[PDB]
Design a protein around this motif. Sequence first.
Motif, PDB file in Angstrom:
ATOM      1  N   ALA A 158      49.268  13.734  24.480  1.00  0.00           N
ATOM      2  CA  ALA A 158      48.331  13.990  23.626  1.00  0.00           C
ATOM      3  C   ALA A 158      48.444  13.327  22.256  1.00  0.00           C
ATOM      4  CB  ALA A 158      48.657  15.307  23.546  1.00  0.00           C
ATOM      5  N   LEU A 159      49.828  13.014  21.776  1.00  0.00           N
ATOM      6  CA  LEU A 159      49.798  12.155  20.549  1.00  0.00           C
ATOM      7  C   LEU A 159      49.293  10.736  20.770  1.00  0.00           C
ATOM      8  CD1 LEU A 159      53.203  13.401  19.399  1.00  0.00           C
ATOM      9  CD2 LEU A 159      50.914  14.205  18.643  1.00  0.00           C
ATOM     10  N   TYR A 160      49.605  10.043  21.812  1.00  0.00           N
ATOM     11  CA  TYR A 160      48.878   8.754  22.163  1.00  0.00           C
ATOM     12  C   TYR A 160      47.447   8.956  22.198  1.00  0.00           C
ATOM     13  CZ  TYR A 160      48.265   3.851  23.246  1.00  0.00           C
ATOM     14  OH  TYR A 160      47.774   2.529  23.144  1.00  0.00           O
ATOM     15  N   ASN A 196      51.975  25.564  21.691  1.00  0.00           N
ATOM     16  CA  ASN A 196      52.412  25.227  22.955  1.00  0.00           C
ATOM     17  C   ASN A 196      53.200  23.883  23.123  1.00  0.00           C
ATOM     18  OD1 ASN A 196      52.090  25.582  26.082  1.00  0.00           O
ATOM     19  ND2 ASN A 196      50.424  24.220  25.911  1.00  0.00           N
ATOM     20  N   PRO A 197      54.333  24.048  22.872  1.00  0.00           N
ATOM     21  CA  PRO A 197      55.191  22.735  22.881  1.00  0.00           C
ATOM     22  C   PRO A 197      55.454  22.178  24.262  1.00  0.00           C
ATOM     23  CG  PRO A 197      56.624  24.781  22.561  1.00  0.00           C
ATOM     24  CD  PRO A 197      55.130  25.140  22.312  1.00  0.00           C
ATOM     25  N   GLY A 198      55.132  23.105  25.523  1.00  0.00           N
ATOM     26  CA  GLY A 198      55.030  22.534  26.613  1.00  0.00           C
ATOM     27  C   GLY A 198      54.050  21.228  26.778  1.00  0.00           C
ATOM     28  N   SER A 199      53.151  21.339  26.315  1.00  0.00           N
ATOM     29  CA  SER A 199      52.071  20.415  26.371  1.00  0.00           C
ATOM     30  C   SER A 199      52.579  19.077  26.034  1.00  0.00           C
ATOM     31  CB  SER A 199      50.876  20.800  25.350  1.00  0.00           C
ATOM     32  OG  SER A 199      51.131  20.471  24.140  1.00  0.00           O
ATOM     33  N   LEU A 200      53.639  19.253  24.977  1.00  0.00           N
ATOM     34  CA  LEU A 200      54.151  17.722  24.702  1.00  0.00           C
ATOM     35  C   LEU A 200      54.975  17.276  25.650  1.00  0.00           C
ATOM     36  CD1 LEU A 200      55.192  19.010  20.956  1.00  0.00           C
ATOM     37  CD2 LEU A 200      53.419  17.168  21.718  1.00  0.00           C
ATOM     38  N   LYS A 201      55.389  17.853  26.797  1.00  0.00           N
ATOM     39  CA  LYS A 201      55.994  17.306  27.727  1.00  0.00           C
ATOM     40  C   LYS A 201      55.429  16.493  28.994  1.00  0.00           C
ATOM     41  CE  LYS A 201      58.887  21.505  28.179  1.00  0.00           C
ATOM     42  NZ  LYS A 201      58.124  22.913  28.538  1.00  0.00           N
ATOM     43  N   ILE A 202      54.133  16.275  28.649  1.00  0.00           N
ATOM     44  CA  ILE A 202      53.237  15.179  29.696  1.00  0.00           C
ATOM     45  C   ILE A 202      53.563  13.980  28.792  1.00  0.00           C
ATOM     46  CG2 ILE A 202      51.021  14.667  30.220  1.00  0.00           C
ATOM     47  CD1 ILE A 202      50.206  17.898  29.928  1.00  0.00           C
TER      48      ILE A 202
END
Length: 281
Positions: free
Chosen positions: A234-236, A266-272
């Motif tokens: 998501a950050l890239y 939704n911090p789980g989204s950072l796990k991708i």
Amino acid sequence: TYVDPHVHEFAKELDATNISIDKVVGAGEFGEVCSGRLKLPSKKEISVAIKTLKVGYTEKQRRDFLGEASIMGQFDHPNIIRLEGVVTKSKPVMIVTEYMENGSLDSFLRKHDAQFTVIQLVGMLRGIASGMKYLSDMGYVHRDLAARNILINSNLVCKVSDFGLSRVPIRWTSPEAIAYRKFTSASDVWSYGIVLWEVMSYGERPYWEMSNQDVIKAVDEGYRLPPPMDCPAALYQLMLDCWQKDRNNRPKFEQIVSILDKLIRNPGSLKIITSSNLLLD
């Protein structure tokens, strides 16, 4: 709305009896840099950063020095460095700003490589975006948004600093701003994308030590900085969006804040996670 000065309109004149100097932190562009304490009119005492204008300054140095305060003083936002005031009626002339225990963000992160959680990093990034959203709302284009120009306090809150270069640094500058000096809030969004990369890379230099000529040509050809190690997808993607060739396709600061807030929620989204060489986008 920001008003271009290029002052007592936007800066409080402080009484020097209320300022004490505690520590000298080397030299700045215009004089010395130190920190200390300021006694407010209510008698409360706060820590402050203090900069002085060198003895024997030129009139241009005085104007440039105080010019930063006339800009900073226009902003009142938790993610923009606060101007406490100036001393002009006695010499040395001084600018007094909020104290930031952890200093510049790039040097701070270099000391702590891989030591923060992704949520902590996103919180830093959200603060920076919130400050930029305010500046852009005010019609100010920063032109020098870079991690070295963000300061971070004892609680890891990040705040935009260094108002010397903008108005109503090749590695941080958008291609159109390089090509023909087209500076807009969208060129600040490009710069924000670079800061996002710096943060996720713990203060690695954007484009490392590439020839300036090659930074310009590579970015023009569509090459971009590669994903930092372990960078959330998501950050890239957010970096890539900030780095769109067409400035009209970049997100607005409000959208960036919104994107980051959703990640915080939704911090789980950072796990991708995405899977010293540039990548062709």
